[PDB]
Write a protein that binds this ligand. Structure first.
Ligand code: HEM
Ligand SMILES: CC1(C)[C@@H]2CC[C@@]1(C)C(=O)C2
Ligand SMILES: [K+]
Length: 404
């Protein structure tokens, strides 16, 4: 626990640890939701992880993402040393400067590429599921959650699949560090990987995402090698540590809820709406901002340089935003969340992510309609900048499945 700063009143202290929350065994979203109990103020100070503010309600989270003059993306991660080393583009930049880089990132991960990759996304989902179908069991995180999104990103990026173990290790040290590497060390190893590839693709431009970023233009002028690396690094993290985790939270839920499986089996056209409700209930990201100057926000004095965690996960879990927020309702009329961000840094890979999710739900339920958590298993979650699932053993009777 770090020393309570003079300007922070004792009454706003709530020592929540975002990398190892106290109620983790009840589920990671349940763990973070203890910040929304009756007794907790809208804005708390935790002495964990060097000390920082935590906005616990959607209203505050949304408001702070909107106000980039007061809440800057220059230092967006806790701990402070990770935020300071963080220099990915466009996420480490505030408008106006940030905006020219979004258009180039959109070219490689936006709807354009989702349409280039439509056939391969569909084919890989169906192939991986058909291969598992006759087995009557799988380790979902290793057998589908990782390979499906990761192989698609490595295809898009023109990178060999043999590089996956190394890159997935490094990306995971930036979001759920095990202690072996600091953020700065993981980030520099990621750049060390990309440096030579970017120079080669600048000399001999190809069709892959690294070539397109490395030879791209930003508001009509050529991107620099340095800028290309800082954008590429960010795409590698997005590709290897977002959807990968979300798919396991969703499959864990479906394995525990036969009535929700039945609803999507009976009415497959509800899968897009089901995806959005699952994106709210199993929201999983939490980054934040740094105060650019002293500022009074919602009755609380904030000081220049103070870090504030604005958990994207928390907005849709707020009861003031959604009634009975821990219940999954595929017919929920107004599904409000900030799972993909809020403000000018809204996720650019959200269309790729929703396609991957929707394809997985549809193709899994077509072939393996009935499945459950392996008998006796207790599913364990992990927390960080992006939360996840440690392992997800599933079982089913092959006699209830069908080959397409
Ligand atoms: C379930 C999946 C995903 C979730 C929940 C998610 C969540 C987020 C969030 C919350 C942000 C904003 C961060 C901030 O404001 O500091 C963000 C930004 C971004 N995400 Fe996604 N993401 C997902 C998938 C992806 C994928 C597959 C990619 C592909 C690389 C990707 C690429 C990006 C990019 C490039 C940005 C930066 C936009 C900017 O800073 O202007 N994301 N994402
Ligand atoms: C917070 C995020 C999910 C968003 C995209 C990848 C991520 C870890 C970043 O560094 C930005
Ligand atoms: K920084």
């Amino acid at each position: 626990l770090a020393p309570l700063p003079p300007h922070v009143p004792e009454h706003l202290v709530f020592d929540f640890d975002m990398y190892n929350p106290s109620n983790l065994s009840a589920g990671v979203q349940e763990a973070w939701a203890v910040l929304q109990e009756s007794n907790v103020p809208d804005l708390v100070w935790t002495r964990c992880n060097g000390g920082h503010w935590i906005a616990t309600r959607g209203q505050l989270i949304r408001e702070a993402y909107e106000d980039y003059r007061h809440f800057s993306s220059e230092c967006p991660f806790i701990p402070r040393e990770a935020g300071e080393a963080y220099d990915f583009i466009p996420t480490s930049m505030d408008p106006p400067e940030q905006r020219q880089f979004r258009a180039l990132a959109n070219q490689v991960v936006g709807m354009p590429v989702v349409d280039k990759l439509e056939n391969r996304i569909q084919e890989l989902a169906c192939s991986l599921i058909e291969s598992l179908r006759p087995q009557g069991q799988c380790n979902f995180t290793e057998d589908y959650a990782e390979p499906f999104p990761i192989r698609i990103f490595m295809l898009l990026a023109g990178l060999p699949e043999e590089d996956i173990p190394h890159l997935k290790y490094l990306t995971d040290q930036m979001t759920r560090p095990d202690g072996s590497m600091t953020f700065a060390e993981a980030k520099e190893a990621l750049y060390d990987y990309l440096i030579p590839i970017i120079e080669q693709r600048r000399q001999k431009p190809g069709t892959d995402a690294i070539s397109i970023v490395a030879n791209g233009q930003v508001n009509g002028r050529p991107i620099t090698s340095d800028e290309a690396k800082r954008m590429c690094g960010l795409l590698l993290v997005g590709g290897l540590d977002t959807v990968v985790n979300f798919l396991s939270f969703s499959m864990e839920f479906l394995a525990k809820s036969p009535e929700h499986r039945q609803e999507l089996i009976q009415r497959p056209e509800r899968i897009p709406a089901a995806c959005e409700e699952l994106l709210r209930r199993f929201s999983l990201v939490a980054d934040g901002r740094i105060l650019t100057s002293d500022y009074e926000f919602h009755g609380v004095q904030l000081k220049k340089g103070d870090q504030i965690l604005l958990p994207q996960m928390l907005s849709g879990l707020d009861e003031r935003e959604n009634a009975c927020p821990m219940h999954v309702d595929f017919s929920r009329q107004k599904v409000s969340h900030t799972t993909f961000g809020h403000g000018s840094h809204l996720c650019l890979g959200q269309h790729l992510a929703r396609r991957e999710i929707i394809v997985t739900l549809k193709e899994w339920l077509t072939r393996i309609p009935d499945f459950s958590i392996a008998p006796g298993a207790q599913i364990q979650h992990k927390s960080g900048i992006v939360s996840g699932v440690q392992a997800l053993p599933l079982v089913w009777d092959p006699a209830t499945t069908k080959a397409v």
